[PDB]
């Protein structure tokens, strides 16, 4: 009985940890996507600048 209780508690702890880790990794992926979006926006602005500089 003692061993079973220990195992059950371990399982609950690990499950909660996996839930937190999944949420955190999803949030960090969202942040990376946002920063990539900003980089792409300024890169397209610079590409337009280069297109005009082709006439420069």
């Amino acid at each position: 009985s003692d061993k079973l209780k220990e195992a059950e508690t371990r399982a609950e702890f690990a499950e909660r940890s996996v839930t937190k880790l999944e949420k955190s990794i999803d949030d960090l992926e969202d942040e990376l996507y946002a920063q990539k979006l900003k980089y792409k926006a300024i890169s397209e602005e610079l590409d337009h600048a280069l297109n005009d500089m082709t006439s420069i």
Partner: protein
């Protein structure tokens, strides 16, 4: 200075293309990443069911 401008704009467009390929690769990475998110979500949900 003319050939300097020429080589410089050449390398400019060159690294443009290179970083562009890298961005394409990173976009494909994000896409397969979202595929991984969806597959992990569905298999996790099946496990939880």
């Amino acid at each position: 200075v003319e050939k300097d401008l020429n080589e410089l704009q050449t390398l400019i467009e060159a690294h443009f293309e290179n970083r562009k390929k890298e961005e394409e690769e990173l976009i494909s990475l994000k896409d397969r990443i979202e595929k991984r998110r969806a597959e992990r979500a569905e298999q996790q949900r099946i496990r939880n069911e």
